[PDB]
Amino acid sequence: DKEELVQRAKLAEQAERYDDMAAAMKEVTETGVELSNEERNLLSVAYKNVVGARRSSWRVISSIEQKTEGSERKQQMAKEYRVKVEKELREICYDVLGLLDKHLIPKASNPESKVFYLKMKGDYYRYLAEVATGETRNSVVEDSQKAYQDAFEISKAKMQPTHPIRLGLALNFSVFYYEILNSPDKACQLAKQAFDDAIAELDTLNEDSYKDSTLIMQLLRDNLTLWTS
Amino acid sequence: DKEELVQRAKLAEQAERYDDMAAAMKEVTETGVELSNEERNLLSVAYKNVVGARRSSWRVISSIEQKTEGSERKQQMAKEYRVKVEKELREICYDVLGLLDKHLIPKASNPESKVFYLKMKGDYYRYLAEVATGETRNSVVEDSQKAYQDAFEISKAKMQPTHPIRLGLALNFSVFYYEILNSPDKACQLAKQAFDDAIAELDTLNEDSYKDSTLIMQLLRDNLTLWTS
Amino acid sequence: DWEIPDGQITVGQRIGGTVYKGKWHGDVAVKMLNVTAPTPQQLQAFKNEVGVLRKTRHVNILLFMGYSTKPQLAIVTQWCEGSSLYHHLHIIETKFEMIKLIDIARQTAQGMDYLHAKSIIHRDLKSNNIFLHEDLTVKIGDFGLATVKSRWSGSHQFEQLSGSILWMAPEVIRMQDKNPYSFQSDVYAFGIVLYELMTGQLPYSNINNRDQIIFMVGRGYLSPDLSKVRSNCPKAMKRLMAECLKKKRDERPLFPQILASIELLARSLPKIHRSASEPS
Amino acid sequence: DWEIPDGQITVGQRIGGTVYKGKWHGDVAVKMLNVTAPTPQQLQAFKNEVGVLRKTRHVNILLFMGYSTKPQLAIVTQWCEGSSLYHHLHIIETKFEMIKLIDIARQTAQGMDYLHAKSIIHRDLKSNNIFLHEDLTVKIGDFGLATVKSRWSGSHQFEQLSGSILWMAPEVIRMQDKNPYSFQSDVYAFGIVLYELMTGQLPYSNINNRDQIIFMVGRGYLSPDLSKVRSNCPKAMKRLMAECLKKKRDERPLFPQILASIELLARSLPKIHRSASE
Amino acid sequence: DEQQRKRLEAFLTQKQKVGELKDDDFEKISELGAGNGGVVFKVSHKPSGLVMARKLIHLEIKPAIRNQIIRELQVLHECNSPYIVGFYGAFYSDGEISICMEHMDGGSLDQVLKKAGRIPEQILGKVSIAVIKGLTYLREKHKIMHRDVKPSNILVNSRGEIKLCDFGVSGQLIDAMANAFVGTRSYMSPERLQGTHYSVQSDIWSMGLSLVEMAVGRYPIPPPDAKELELMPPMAIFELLDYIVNEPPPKLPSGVFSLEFQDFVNKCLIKNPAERADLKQLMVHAFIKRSDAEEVDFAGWLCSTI
Ligand SMILES: Nc1ncnc2c1ncn2[C@@H]1O[C@H](COP(=O)(O)OP(=O)(O)OP(O)(O)=S)[C@@H](O)[C@H]1O
Ligand SMILES: O=C(NOCCO)c1ccc2cncn2c1Nc1ccc(I)cc1F
Ligand SMILES: [Mg+2]
Numbered sequence A, B: 001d002k003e004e005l006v007q008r009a010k011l012a013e014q015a016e017r018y019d020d021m022a023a024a025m026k027e028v029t030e031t032g033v034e035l036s037n038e039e040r041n042l043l044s045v046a047y048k049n050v051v052g053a054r055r056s057s058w059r060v061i062s063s064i065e066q067k068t069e070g071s072e073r074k075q076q077m078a079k080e081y082r083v084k085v086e087k088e089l090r091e092i093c094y095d096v097l098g099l100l101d102k103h104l105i106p107k108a109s110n111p112e113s114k115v116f117y118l119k120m121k122g123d124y125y126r127y128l129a130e131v132a133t134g135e136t137r138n139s140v141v142e143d144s145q146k147a148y149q150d151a152f153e154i155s156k157a158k159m160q161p162t163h164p165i166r167l168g169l170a171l172n173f174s175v176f177y178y179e180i181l182n183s184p185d186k187a188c189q190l191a192k193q194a195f196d197d198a199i200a201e202l203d204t205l206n207e208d209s210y211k212d213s214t215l216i217m218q219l220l221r222d223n224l225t226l227w228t229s
Numbered sequence C: 001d002w003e004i005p006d007g008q009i010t011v012g013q014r015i016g017g018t019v020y021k022g023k024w025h026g027d028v029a030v031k032m033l034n035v036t037a038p039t040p041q042q043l044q045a046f047k048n049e050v051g052v053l054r055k056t057r058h059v060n061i062l063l064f065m066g067y068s069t070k071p072q073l074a075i076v077t078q079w080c081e082g083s084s085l086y087h088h089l090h091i092i093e094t095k096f097e098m099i100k101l102i103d104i105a106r107q108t109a110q111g112m113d114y115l116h117a118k119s120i121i122h123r124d125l126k127s128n129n130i131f132l133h134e135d136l137t138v139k140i141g142d143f144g145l146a147t148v149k150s151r152w153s154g155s156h157q158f159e160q161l162s163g164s165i166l167w168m169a170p171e172v173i174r175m176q177d178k179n180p181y182s183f184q185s186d187v188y189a190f191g192i193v194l195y196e197l198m199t200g201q202l203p204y205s206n207i208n209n210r211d212q213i214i215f216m217v218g219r220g221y222l223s224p225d226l227s228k229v230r231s232n233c234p235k236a237m238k239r240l241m242a243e244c245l246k247k248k249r250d251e252r253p254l255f256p257q258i259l260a261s262i263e264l265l266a267r268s269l270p271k272i273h274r275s276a277s278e279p280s
Numbered sequence D: 001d002w003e004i005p006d007g008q009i010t011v012g013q014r015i016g017g018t019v020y021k022g023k024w025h026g027d028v029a030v031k032m033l034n035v036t037a038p039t040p041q042q043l044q045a046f047k048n049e050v051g052v053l054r055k056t057r058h059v060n061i062l063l064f065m066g067y068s069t070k071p072q073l074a075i076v077t078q079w080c081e082g083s084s085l086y087h088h089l090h091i092i093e094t095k096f097e098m099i100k101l102i103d104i105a106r107q108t109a110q111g112m113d114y115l116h117a118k119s120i121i122h123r124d125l126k127s128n129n130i131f132l133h134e135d136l137t138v139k140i141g142d143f144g145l146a147t148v149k150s151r152w153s154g155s156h157q158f159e160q161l162s163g164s165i166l167w168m169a170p171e172v173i174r175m176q177d178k179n180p181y182s183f184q185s186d187v188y189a190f191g192i193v194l195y196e197l198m199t200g201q202l203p204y205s206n207i208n209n210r211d212q213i214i215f216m217v218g219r220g221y222l223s224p225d226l227s228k229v230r231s232n233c234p235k236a237m238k239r240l241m242a243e244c245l246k247k248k249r250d251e252r253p254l255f256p257q258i259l260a261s262i263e264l265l266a267r268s269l270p271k272i273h274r275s276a277s278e
Numbered sequence E: 001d002e003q004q005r006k007r008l009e010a011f012l013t014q015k016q017k018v019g020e021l022k023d024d025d026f027e028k029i030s031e032l033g034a035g036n037g038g039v040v041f042k043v044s045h046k047p048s049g050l051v052m053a054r055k056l057i058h059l060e061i062k063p064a065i066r067n068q069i070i071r072e073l074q075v076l077h078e079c080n081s082p083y084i085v086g087f088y089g090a091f092y093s094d095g096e097i098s099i100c101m102e103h104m105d106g107g108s109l110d111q112v113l114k115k116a117g118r119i120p121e122q123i124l125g126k127v128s129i130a131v132i133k134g135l136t137y138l139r140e141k142h143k144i145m146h147r148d149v150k151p152s153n154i155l156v157n158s159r160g161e162i163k164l165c166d167f168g169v170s171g172q173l174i175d176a177m178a179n180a181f182v183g184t185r186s187y188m189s190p191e192r193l194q195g196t197h198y199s200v201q202s203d204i205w206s207m208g209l210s211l212v213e214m215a216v217g218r219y220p221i222p223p224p225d226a227k228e229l230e231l232m233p234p235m236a237i238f239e240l241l242d243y244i245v246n247e248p249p250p251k252l253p254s255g256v257f258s259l260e261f262q263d264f265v266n267k268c269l270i271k272n273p274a275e276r277a278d279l280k281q282l283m284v285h286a287f288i289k290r291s292d293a294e295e296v297d298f299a300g301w302l303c304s305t306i
Helices: A003-014 A020-029 A038-068 A073-104 A111-131 A136-158 A164-179 A185-199 A202-208 A211-227 B003-014 B020-029 B038-068 B073-100 B111-131 B137-158 B164-179 B184-200 B211-227 C040-053 C085-090 C098-117 C170-174 C183-199 C210-219 C235-244 C255-268 D040-053 D085-090 D098-117 D170-174 D183-199 D210-219 D235-244 D258-266 E002-017 E063-078 E109-116 E121-142 E171-176 E200-216 E226-231 E237-246 E259-268 E279-283 E286-293 E298-304
Strands: C018-023 C027-032 C064-068 C074-078 C130-133 C137-140 D018-023 D027-032 D064-068 D074-078 D130-133 D137-140 E026-034 E038-045 E051-058 E087-093 E096-102 E154-156 E162-164
Touching (some): B003 B020, B020 B073, B038 B111, B164 B211, C085 C130, C098 C137, C170 C210, E063 E087, E109 E200, E121 E162
Antiparallel strands (some): D064 D074, E051 E096, E154 E162
16 A cells, blocks of 8 residues: 555654655655655655755765864764765665656656656756766766756746746756856856746746745845855 | 764764764774763763654654544554654664663763763663553663662762752653652652752852753753642 | 934835834834824824823833924834734734743733833723734834823813724723723723733624624623633633723723733743753 | 832842842843942942933843932843853854854944934943844943033043953043044944954954053054954955054044945845755 | 616726726826725726726735625626616725725715705605615615615715615625724614614615705704704714614604605604614605605706705
């Protein structure tokens, strides 16, 4: 039964534990049945939390290592954390992408849901692209570029300028241009275009985003101001 | 080297991850060398946070169990999940007591340290006492009782009426009397006595612990005003 | 002196005399007499309202900052971020905990105690004139009907009854005395505020006939249905509410009595719960 | 009138004339003249301090509530929950974000602007007299040295120099004029506050000789080492700090100039986070 | 009849000529008057060119109920009668429900009664017919009672039309208006004041009281003293209400009015609604038979008194 699994995952999400939740959702997707709209946000939620934790401890190791600037086992441990929490970070994202192509790629009826699946893929690939430096990391960046372009086409085709998902794709793709792309000109132009699109569906804010869409516009203003600063 | 281990544990404490921290501190105590004052509070923070996350999970899962009030497989699945949480909760506390009664309590030169470790032992036995319901309750309840009495004797002998540790022992022992044994008369008497002897040396409050002392003080007052109602 | 030389104030948006959000050494609230030819009655109104505010300095009275004459007659006060108690309770239905509700009662009483102590009767106390500033601090405002008790009974004369009916005491409605206002009439209004706080609704929700309410309350037929208090309302509060609402004004306790009862009920309803394993 | 009839106030704990936590229509702060026989000099002190507070009603001035005479001379003000800026910055080393630090600057300036606008010179502005009430609102307090500018130059007369040295302007220290205080001296103190805000430390930390600091600052030898500003400090703030700290008092910004570098900074320098992920 | 038909035709024509309504659509011409909670403006609806009366009623209300008020007012689009003021549309902007309606250039009989001093029994006859037909119209074709009949709510125009306005069509608007400021007088029937009864019988009383006010040319405040009736500080509203409830109804002076008129207002003002004449009974009343049959240049009398 599926409903026992989704109640178990939802209950574990209410208990602020994101290991039993991720295991339960991987066990859901391993069945290979197509999700609903509701059962998907739970999967992204735990995955997003895991990505955030990887950025958080790994990010702390990054800045902490710079502060040391010595040559020791404390410094060795900072390097060790880059190899280890980074390897832990790598294992989580590879499990996500394997559960994505294996289950999410196989079943998808809603075209909007496809954008969410492609937006998630670009997110996890970009995070990986941001983390590692080299040729494999460059390949991951290329993978995220193709994924976000594929999502951007369907967003420009069959989405609303005020929907949450198109706004989120514009947001993630703009911060991809700024941080991985390292360009403030094109990134600010893209953010401005996304804000204009969100404003341009005033009637479609009411169902797709409205207050959430306004918050996304505020985030674009924050990003744009920072990049123009 | 010890200092690489304590810097690794402190760094992981700054990253809000309490698994690598607990593993690093268990690896510290497994060496079997006596801790400082500083290296001890880290250990207590780690093994408090790990049990606390599971405690919050247990509380909210049990409230859902009391909330459902139907007849289906949700209750069986939820009860089974609670049993799994107890099994995880049980494993953590047993690891703590095994790390405690084999390297720290029998080798404890400072009597203040003896009050500390005995306070921790009584705490973790109370942690096990709230969750295991049956015949095995009467063992750990009496075990915590002996541990807190042993700490209370040394507190009444060679501690200050304004020290943080004696105040914490009074606090934990009072909530032990109220929740586990349900004799709120002796808990009321105990907390009132500890609070009145806490007033006496109000002038003797050095900068090392003002925040802790007044924090346990107002917590004691809050518990008193809850119980006298 | 508190006259703000002309030009300094920078009127902006509107909210609801008439009230604007302006600028004068930061955000302020500006309350204006829109019109152009101030009648000597509107003039004494202004003079009186300023006169009262001048005597207030207390954290629960909305802060009078100064007045202007030349452009239009206006009163400048602190700006408030956050909503009126009316707005919380009946618009966005804020789910305050009972300890908070008691505290709002407490602070409102504190501000009223302070006014009465300087002999000011507010005369228009109600949910709308009670602001939860930064969601944490009750500021009582709108002193447009406020007055100072005169030692002499013949200074009163004739004033056309005005105010919101749901908060008007029966003796005020009846309007039989030369001066039916008293500290006790303010208490009654505060009584209706307790009602909104402990029930979540205005009184007389089944009646929508304005004149009927005036007539039935003044006559003694109609009075708030205290059964509508929510179940988490401390018994001491229900009693205290019923006391503030007594029809015979002299039976209503004053601000000192509210201070006497406001502390003990809050102490009795402790919000402490769970109490186990404190990091300290 | 703001005289509180005797008996109403209920003095409690102590904190640091002398200041107690008391009770009068809620928690209040009570500042007392401990002694029993008030000299006519301590009397005029009291009369003057009350006189100044009476003219203040602004969210960034600590709220004067009333005064008492009969038991002892005392000033009653709002109680504050939360610590002084001194305490945050040098005791518990609160890790404020730069936008917050700028905002504290902003509010402190707002309160000072309001005082100067009514011709009050505070004369004892410093970290300790700036309270972060509920951690969100700057309230400037302690008006024990506050004074109102007299239109006439001969009313001044002789006052023994008192105050904390780290915030005293060189001209005040030197004490060469009949009246060396000015709006500009207050600005200088605020300048030192910017220093604490943008650096995290008091000035002259290598020098522990009290008389040496008085002598070297008054002489022009010594002045704050602006290099110690933390790297996240907006360039506009560093400049604004150096301007408030100018030795030539007229050089330091005043009234409108004071509400220009800080007001200009307020409409600029924002957002330390570029995050937008949702 | 033909004239009223043509008027309704023109109204529907302008209705179809226009479309939706919103605050930008309007230009203020003048202020037609104000009351206890509402303000009325003569305005020009920019898209259509129509001159209409715009009534604003201040209300702080939830979106869900404002939208319910609008939706319920849309029933007026069908309310077509020469005894009922016409409806163009309704909306909510800023803090205020707007009702846009047939501009009546003659004003309210309240305004008229000020300039005319007293209204001639013969004109009041036309008014009495107009009110009854309109109350009948509302009752039968729209299931509703007026609630609020009084001189300020009967509107008259150049073409001699007497129409009713401000009646209780939106039930939600009725509800939302209950939180209100205190009035200075009242036309409420005693049985309503006592919550004893609620029907058209109550609107009949108000018409009755209105008529007496319009006939004598003075509002009802415990009638007038022996001296005051020879010529021809205000009583607080609670006292007025207490009067209405506990005292005998007002009545017309003895000689100045026909016995038929005196009898007519009397059957409208009987305290007990049961014993009070109804619309059927009033319609065939001596005073109504007479007045119906009379021909009066009402439109002429109106313009001549302004
Ligand atoms: N369609 C209209 N055309 C011309 N004048 C109007 C129109 N509607 C209202 N007025 C005038 O606006 C004023 C108020 O009339 P109403 O809307 O009926 O309210 P009211 O009779 O004053 O009752 P209160 O006191 O507000 S409870 C009166 O002077 C009307 O004559
Ligand atoms: O207008 C009203 N009261 O007067 C305001 C106080 O000044 C009024 C009152 C109640 C009501 C219920 N349903 C509509 N209601 C009103 N409006 C209205 C009704 C018919 C028409 I034709 C035109 C209108 F504006
Ligand atoms: Mg009306």
